[PDB]
Design a binder for this molecule. Structure first.
Ligand SMILES: NC(=O)c1ccc[n+]([C@@H]2O[C@H](COP(=O)([O-])OP(=O)(O)OC[C@H]3O[C@@H](n4cnc5c(N)ncnc54)[C@H](O)[C@@H]3O)[C@@H](O)[C@H]2O)c1
Ligand SMILES: NC(=O)c1ccc[n+]([C@@H]2O[C@H](COP(=O)([O-])OP(=O)(O)OC[C@H]3O[C@@H](n4cnc5c(N)ncnc54)[C@H](O)[C@@H]3O)[C@@H](O)[C@H]2O)c1
Ligand SMILES: Cc1cc2nc3c(=O)[nH]c(=O)nc-3n(C[C@H](O)[C@H](O)[C@H](O)COP(=O)(O)O)c2cc1C
Ligand SMILES: Cc1cc2nc3c(=O)[nH]c(=O)nc-3n(C[C@H](O)[C@H](O)[C@H](O)COP(=O)(O)O)c2cc1C
Ligand SMILES: [Mg+2]
Ligand SMILES: [Zn+2]
Ligand SMILES: [Zn+2]
Lengths: 337, 352
């Protein structure tokens, strides 16, 4: 049905087994009879053939497939496949393996968005392990790898080339969202709203601080929009705060990037207001305290929260009632600023 | 001074380049003349020649180094160097590139702890991109890759314990695919002063188990079953961490979201934590006046999301332990507060 995989050695095998674990249907071509053999032994069925033959690709279902995984090792063959596919199967999304930088560059120029250098992440992981056995903590080693990865990709993208409302959205599952999605649909029908969805930008929890601080600089209203999770916020939003509100950008000497900007907490909850009469300091507004303190410390003005309660039990029309009041609040804020 | 890298091609150059940024001092063995100029550019000492030569290895400082990175591509050569080092330089920690699962298994059998299959994490990123373009969210896709990584490593670990033929391995593949607990969540445990002393104290008691989340899950891929198993044995659960923006570390929040599952911790039914106790043990830079901020001021208010979480899951919330003033702290206050932490734990178990 949806995926063709060209090459089913070390690289292709892993990519295909991940997709199988998600119940994705695929057809696999390999031109190595020994690899096909070893795979038969482990219950994987792979078809024999050179994937640069458009007749083979065509019978594998290329005209109807969504994604082709180019996992061929040889740069020139890998590149031939790429060019042939975009000429004969232009609807087909190409995801490609790259042997090295030279190969990655040729793939970028061919129009592949994100070529994966075959040894890059493994070599990065090896570096982390070496740092660890030298005594760095595992987490700090991983942050250093994240910093190097961002620098190296930017460098390599450059080589390839050479040849106001800011909503910080922090739903972990934006595609599964009912309440927050409706809120965003409504907020989009204003100008000039920018939305930064953290879990789409940073699935590996590697905040790009410079990019985030740049967006915040162009914002007059910042919004923390998220579903409530355990009387609190999602892990990535907490990470965003800890990293982006840096010394001395958000606080200290000096430190004043956020001064005079406003902040709004826009939160959705499963339970209704009565669900929060628990513990030593009951009530919904008490839950804002860490966030409000955070904002005030960094020189932000804290607006009264937008809270959409009772998303568990409802009419599927307060989902749009309360969603419109969200837009109302944003529009209100800006007609005054 | 500290690191030897054997092989400086695509794999060795990335690894060595990461280490430069960390100011690590290294020496490199490599037998390709096309890399000599790249090594010179970085100012790195190179021994040109076959890295399996005992003389080059000795010249490179093998007897003195802490770490050897085996970034040789050819599996036999890689394995040869590994055995050489295991035999003659037993102090030397080996980090090894593995070509594939067969090479990985043989390195494991040779005593290498975590060989890194060279294409594995990259093939996993490619699979994630495939899933995204088929409509999965990036994050949900990353989580699927975490589940797959965990099971894959477990599977390959069991294949390593059996004989080196495909039939023996394919058989294993087919069969397999068919009391105080301190939850410590400082992101930088080695840089800790206050929490480190707290743990130094707590470790003098028994039976205390410590799970350092940032040592265990630097990639924020929580093993829910392992965490739930450890909780099953605990009578007192401690969330121990430094305060970060009036709240908790991101990884502790992920641990709650993931480990307090439906219905293990709440729902039907849903009662695994019922009857257990919870202590919040937190450290703060500021003193009590530091919390005179916002509409609901005062340190105590801040325990609210934690207390409500605990109550909801049927845990028994204890008065928090807090160590304030770490910003400007007499080591006698730090010594004194660490001891009081131990005191509090001891008094809980004398009571239970
Ligand atoms: O590194 P690797 O282990 O991932 O091997 C690359 C794989 O790609 C396959 N391959 C190379 N060229 C191919 C082509 N033209 N068509 C189909 N498969 C090909 C090889 O047979 C090999 O199995
Ligand atoms: O894939 P790769 O690009 O990472 O290259 C492997 C590297 O290891 C080096 N290498 C292979 N065998 C070696 C040996 N025996 N001694 C020193 N260097 C070696 C090669 O020169 C090559 O640079
Ligand atoms: C991990 C988890 C923890 C949650 N904790 C709370 C809670 O503390 N209080 C609450 O009212 N809702 C809680 N919820 C429910 C969500 O807030 C609710 O489903 C969400 O706001 C719905 O918005 P959505 O349609 O955009 O997903 C939790 C949900 C999950 C996934
Ligand atoms: C990102 C970050 C946020 C912090 N937020 C607070 C805070 O809200 N209140 C406070 O008193 N200290 C805060 N601190 C200080 C730490 O709580 C304090 O340095 C830590 O508890 C010291 O313990 P340690 O020696 O174990 O690292 C913060 C520190 C960092 C790194
Ligand atoms: Mg392949
Ligand atoms: Zn999603
Ligand atoms: Zn550390």
């Amino acid at each position: 049905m949806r995926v063709i995989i060209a090459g089913f050695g070390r690289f292709g095998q892993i990519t295909g087994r991940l997709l199988l674990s998600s119940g994705v249907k695929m057809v696999v071509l390999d031109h190595d009879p020994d690899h096909i053999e070893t795979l038969r032994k482990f219950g994987m069925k792979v078809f024999y053939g050179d994937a640069t033959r458009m007749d083979l690709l065509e019978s594998a279902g290329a005209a109807k497939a969504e994604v082709l995984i180019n996992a061929i090792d040889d740069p020139q063959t890998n590149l031939q496949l790429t060019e042939m596919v975009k000429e004969h199967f232009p609807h087909l999304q190409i995801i490609a393996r790259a042997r090295d930088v030279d190969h990655y560059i040729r793939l970028r120029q061919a129009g592949v968005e994100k070529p994966e250098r075959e040894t890059f992440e493994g070599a990065l992981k090896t570096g982390r392990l070496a740092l660890e056995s030298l005594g760095l903590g595992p987490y700090e080693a991983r942050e250093r790898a994240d910093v190097f990865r961002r620098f190296n990709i930017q460098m390599v993208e450059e080589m390839a080339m050479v040849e106001m409302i800011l909503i910080i959205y922090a739903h972990p599952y934006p595609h599964h969202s009912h309440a927050n999605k409706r809120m965003l649909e409504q907020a989009r029908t204003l100008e000039g709203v920018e939305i930064r969805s953290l879990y789409q930008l940073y699935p590996d929890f590697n905040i790009d601080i410079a990019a985030e601080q740049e967006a915040l600089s162009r914002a007059d209203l910042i919004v923390w929009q998220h579903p409530m999770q355990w009387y609190s916020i999602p892990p990535l939003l907490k990470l965003w705060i800890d990293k982006v509100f840096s010394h001395g950008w958000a606080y200290g000497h000096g430190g004043t990037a956020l001064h005079g900007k406003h902040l709004l907490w826009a939160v959705t909850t499963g339970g209704g207001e009565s669900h929060f009469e628990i513990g030593a300091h009951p009530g919904f507004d008490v839950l804002s305290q860490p966030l409000q303190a955070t904002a005030i410390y960094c020189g932000l003005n804290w607006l009264p929260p937008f809270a959409m309660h009772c998303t568990f039990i409802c009419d599927d029309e307060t989902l749009e009632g309360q969603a419109r009041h969200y837009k109302q609040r944003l529009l209100e804020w800006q007609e005054a600023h």
